[PDB]
Please model this.
Amino acid sequence: QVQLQESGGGLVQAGGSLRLTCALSERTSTSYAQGWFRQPPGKEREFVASLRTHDGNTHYTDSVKGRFTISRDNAENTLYLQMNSLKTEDTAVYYCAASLGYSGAYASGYDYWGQGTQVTVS
Amino acid sequence: QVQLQESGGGLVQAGGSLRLTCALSERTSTSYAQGWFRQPPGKEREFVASLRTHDGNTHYTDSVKGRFTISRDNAENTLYLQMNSLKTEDTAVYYCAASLGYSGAYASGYDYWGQGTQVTVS
Amino acid sequence: QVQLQESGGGLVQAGGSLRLTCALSERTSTSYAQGWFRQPPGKEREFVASLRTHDGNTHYTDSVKGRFTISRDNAENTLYLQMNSLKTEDTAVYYCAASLGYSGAYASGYDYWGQGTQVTVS
Amino acid sequence: NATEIRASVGKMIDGIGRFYIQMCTELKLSDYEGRLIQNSLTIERMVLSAFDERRNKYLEEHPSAGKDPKKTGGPIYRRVDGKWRRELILYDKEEIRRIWRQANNGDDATAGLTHMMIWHSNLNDATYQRTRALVRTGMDPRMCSLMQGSTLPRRSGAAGAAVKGVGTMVMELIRMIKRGINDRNFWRGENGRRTRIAYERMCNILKGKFQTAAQRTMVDQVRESRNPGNAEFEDLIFLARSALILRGSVAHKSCLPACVYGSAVASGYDFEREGYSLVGIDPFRLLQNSQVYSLIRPNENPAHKSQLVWMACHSAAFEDLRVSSFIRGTKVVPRGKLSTRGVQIASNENMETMESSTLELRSRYWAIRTRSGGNTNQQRASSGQISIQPTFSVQRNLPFDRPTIMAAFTGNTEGRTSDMRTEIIRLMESARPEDVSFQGRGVFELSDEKATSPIVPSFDEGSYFFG
Amino acid sequence: NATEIRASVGKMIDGIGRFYIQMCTELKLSDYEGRLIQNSLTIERMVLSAFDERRNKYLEEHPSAGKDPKKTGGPIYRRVDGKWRRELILYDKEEIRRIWRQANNGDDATAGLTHMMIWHSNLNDATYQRTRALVRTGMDPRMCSLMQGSTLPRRSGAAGAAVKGVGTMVMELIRMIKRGINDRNFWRGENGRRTRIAYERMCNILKGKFQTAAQRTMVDQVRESRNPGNAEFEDLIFLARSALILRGSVAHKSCLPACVYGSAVASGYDFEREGYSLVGIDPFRLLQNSQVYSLIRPNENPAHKSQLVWMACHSAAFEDLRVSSFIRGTKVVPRGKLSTRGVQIASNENMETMESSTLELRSRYWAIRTRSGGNTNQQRASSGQISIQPTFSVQRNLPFDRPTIMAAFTGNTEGRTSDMRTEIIRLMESARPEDVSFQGRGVFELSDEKATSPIVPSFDEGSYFFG
Amino acid sequence: NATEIRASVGKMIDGIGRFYIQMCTELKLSDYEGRLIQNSLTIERMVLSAFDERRNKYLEEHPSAGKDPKKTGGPIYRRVDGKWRRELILYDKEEIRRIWRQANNGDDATAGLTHMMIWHSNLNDATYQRTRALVRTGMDPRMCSLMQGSTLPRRSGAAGAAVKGVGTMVMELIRMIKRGINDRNFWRGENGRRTRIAYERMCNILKGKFQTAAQRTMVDQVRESRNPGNAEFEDLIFLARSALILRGSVAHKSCLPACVYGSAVASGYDFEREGYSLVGIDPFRLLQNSQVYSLIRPNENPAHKSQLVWMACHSAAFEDLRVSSFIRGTKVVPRGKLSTRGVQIASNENMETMESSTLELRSRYWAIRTRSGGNTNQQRASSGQISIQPTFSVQRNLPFDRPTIMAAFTGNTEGRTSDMRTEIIRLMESARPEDVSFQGRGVFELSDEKATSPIVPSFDEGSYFFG
Model:
């Protein structure tokens, strides 16, 4: 009963752009917040973006400010992560998170996860 | 003024028998108790037998129980030690003791002594 | 403004005699006391003699008792040190001292000094 | 026979559970708002304040300027849409009384009340080290290890008196000795005759805490004082400081918030028939299938919040951080590095930035909560002479056991307890920090119901939760 | 001039001797039964009980349920044939009084009475270490080395007060301080005015025991208390514990049972003309030609009985076992390995198994009994300053004698005696167990009447008679 | 702004100067006799005795058998020809009063009086270590380092109270606690209400001396006693002994005899316009051009007399002999090797052998007199827990900071100050004799008016002036 299927990852080059998509289960479509985390090679899982639902406010990390934009689809239950000006630092595995009550940087506050999709920016 | 002359010792073989005699001075003939001690080679003086006078009770050590029998002569002042089933452990020097008030195992309670008679059981 | 000029020193032989003279300034002519110190080679300055004025009493060290005699001139302001039976121990530099209030052995109590005159007794 | 007491404890927990369900219906809380631990604290606090007959009897005749005595209340945190909104609610004390009785078969059932009080205790001990009370009472702020149950009222029965520490009893007695030093409160007045029985009782509990003879006898010498002064004051402080090395038997009971018991009862769990025990695996078990939320401030770490609530549920506020980390599987961080404040939300905080998160109250292993204070093993008690009184005038040395005699002079005092002080000091000299206690005792897997296979851990950071 | 006091002591011993002969005639005892030490103890006890005017004056008005006050008695052990038979005899106190007076030229002659009391003392000290009295009085059971003369009455004059130890005086004063803590016994009542003189007197004796200044001055500070409490209590206990290292001057007098003196007088010895001295060789001499028996239980070792009586005759109850073994020639075994009980036979033991044996009261060498407590040699008493108070602001270290200053803070106390405590502690820190006392003093051969050639022994087991 | 206070001090010194000139005219002393320090002491003593309104008010109603209260006097040493002749002079107290007022613009000007009193202090401290007062008051004769201003009256204002040491304040308070232990002097009588204010004031000064928190708080606990007894006694003695290592802030002011100020004013020096400061270079400066004589006994060393007067002029009575020798250039010899007695000549000495000599009051360098007591640098003040209270039954060691806990038990006491004692002891354990204070501070050349270039000395004999 995995709750979030994520896709859109792959292999690009520096300066390019990508668009990650996270299919949302019916439990997850109506939740407090949903965000994106990344795991660089050999590093712990770090925060990328977060989208709240009742209001539309978002939180971003300092590394992707301006470059990334976490959006959501209207009339469908799908999460989007727009990734522009891609850099080698962005090479990681991107997990889709969702929390029943937390919109925040910490990984701990999110209660459901996906299985990653690779982004390698060579 | 030695008070006890002892005799009867000598050389026998294992399984044999001997009879030690202790001449008693007039002080010693009428005393609380008189007994027999033995001194093995290189060992301290140990207890053998003890005979009380007013009643006839006797005390023996565990090594000679049954084998030895300390007796006294009637109409003469002479002490006897009957030694049957003689063993190599019985090889020692036998002293005649007498106490003004003690009938016991300890050597300390006896106030007059003899000069030994050898028993070698080869 | 040196206050005491001393003279009379020189070179003599053992058993001889010498006479040291100390010219006295007008400040020094009328003072509590004036004395003589000696400095042997490599030794600290030690006491020799002392003459008081209001009465004529004098103090001498044990080494020069009898041999030395500190005198003063009448009708002139001049101090004299008569040195008889001269010995090798007397070889030193002789300073003239004067004190506004002290007649004593210690060097510290005298407030004006000369520059020495050599006595070598070879 | 453990089934009797296990069934009684189970009936207590069921009372708290059905009560919390009924209360969640009275407020009409969502399934999320009912599992928020803050609202649970508000509810429990309302119940304890309602059944607080000494407070209500002292507040009816002399009312606090805040609110009428017949009504108790507290903040309930409700969330519509996405915004959190905090509402102040007020309910009659008699109403909460009636609901509690109805939830516990009509009985008063003070056992559950004291249970929630002990839960409040473990949370408060894990949240604040009361340096203010320790410096004002005359104690060392470094003695918080002995300050279990400081927030507890003395009204708590033997169940609550067992969970208190040596330092808490010392402080509570010190307020009594220090109160009688200003006026004649020990006077022949009825207040004095009753207060003497309170004082002797608390001295007997403190005597029951210690597990060494010298400490107990010293407490006995303190109790002999008909009118305690500064001497008995410094004596009790001496006992408290001795409880850091030669520790006392302090009970530790795993007490959970009412929302956990309530969610278990709502799921159909019947604790009378199945049984329950605070020292057993059951609490750990109940925490593995427990789904509890907690409000979180903006920059706080929800993992540290989960650790705080976790330590609150097992009284491990003053435990070795190493062994707590070994039980939980994750690192139990000391209070100084906790990126969090109290679980309670202040009355002045805005709910516009307030959020909530799930509490990770699970543990890798589990272990039996203990009443003991470790291994204290000293009683030389030699009766042999140690000095020689010479009779003959002969050239010789006059022997004496210099270590023992000279050690008998350290820590001396011009009071009746002098000797004991020395002995206690001497005993504390034999104990070392690496002295291992609980020989053979280990932790157990969660699938190990009957503690068949222990796991004795080997340790390499800091062990103190407070600095 | 030693001939005067030697003749007086000789006249005392002759009094006891002729008295014991007359008594052996009154009972009509055989030459063996008169040399049995048990009967001697019964006789001596009868004489001391007869001349016990305070006990008789307190027993006439308030009689003990046992027997009439005018009569004293005790068990006499008689032996017909071979069987021992114990008979309880009773004699009028006035009769024993008259016989004692007739034996001592018609005088009261309390000196011999106190002599027999001191003999009873040395026997009781060598037989029992009163742990019960030490724990009930508040003292350490390991202080029996200071408990010489505990059984002695305070009625014993200066002759008996000299043989008491520091711990005995401390205990006797502690009963007085502890008695006045219950009721107002120090009150203005005549009992209080007299008791103050008793207290000051005993404090002066205790001051006379010590041979170091600090101990004496501390005793002086204890005596200043008009109404002693727990402070003076712990002070006296502190002095007692200090007497283990910095020992006090305790007299030791060789006192023999009345059967020895009686057998010597019966043989024709005239102690007035020949002379006698408890500290001299004479007792040893009298013990070499002494023929004394003692009842022995079945499994007992008669050698250990002889050792017990021997230690009783020279006050060596708390001596170094090594030096006592060197004096006696045979090994003096500690109390734990003594295969014996008290010399006294209990009232419930059957005489069917009871026997007797000769007492080996001889010694290889002899030594002078001493009044001293060894070498205490410390009085630094420096008056030089030890700290620097700086005036100029210059970079330098501010010197101070750290060992002395820091050592002045150990053992401090909030009472008038604080300083002295410290000093005593400091003094006890300088003394070590191997500190040799009695330099040059040795033992002497029995044929050495005037102590011409000493024998200083060299020692390799245990030195303590009690465990 | 230092010019204001510098001008005030200058006006004080000018008052003393013109006064001493006028007095030298009243006696008609020669230029030599006026520079003799003995006559200066007589004059100053006459002035202080005249303005002694408490002594005169207590001597008018109850006269001393010596002389009438209206007249004060003292020996004046005059020299005609070569012989010294000592004459006893008497002058009315009102006359000396009038002359002092006329010399100080008509004002009372008690500041100069207290100045001469402090000069008398430094001389008396440099001359006698009062072992008698220290043993009678209950203090250690080795604490004279803290006994600055012992001879000072308590009448001396803040100027005189600042120059007193910790031991002087402790002794002065100890006379008050020890006086109230005999009778009820603290009673409700007006004497008691006033004496309580005196006691609290002196306790506040003693609190101001200390520069560590523990000492101050301990003094605060001593002052809380409404009726101080032996406890507060031993407490104050404990503080005094602590002032040997953890020293207190004691002021040191260079006070010169009145003949120096008088000779400076007679030469035309105007101290109001030029300025003067006791802590500055000025005293040293004034001593370099100072010509002062002193009577000398026959066999005395005039250099040692000069050293005594020199130490008297800079309060260096308890200074490090090494640093004083470095300041003066010549060796400052300790009191034991001083071939001299007091500067004061006894009343029974004959002037036939008395002489005089010049005083070498010059120094090689100079240094700033300090108010501090050195570097005391300790405040761990850790609030972290130090013991572990175990909850789970797991095999482990129960950690605890053994050094801290065990160090908290040393020096304990059964009084309110116990804790502080311990802390003080603990603090004194951190300090060592080689702990350097006044980092960077050095001495200065005499041509260095503004302390531009310091000279930090390197030291290799003894440092203590007293033994």
Notes: Chains C and A do not touch (no CB pair under 8 Å).
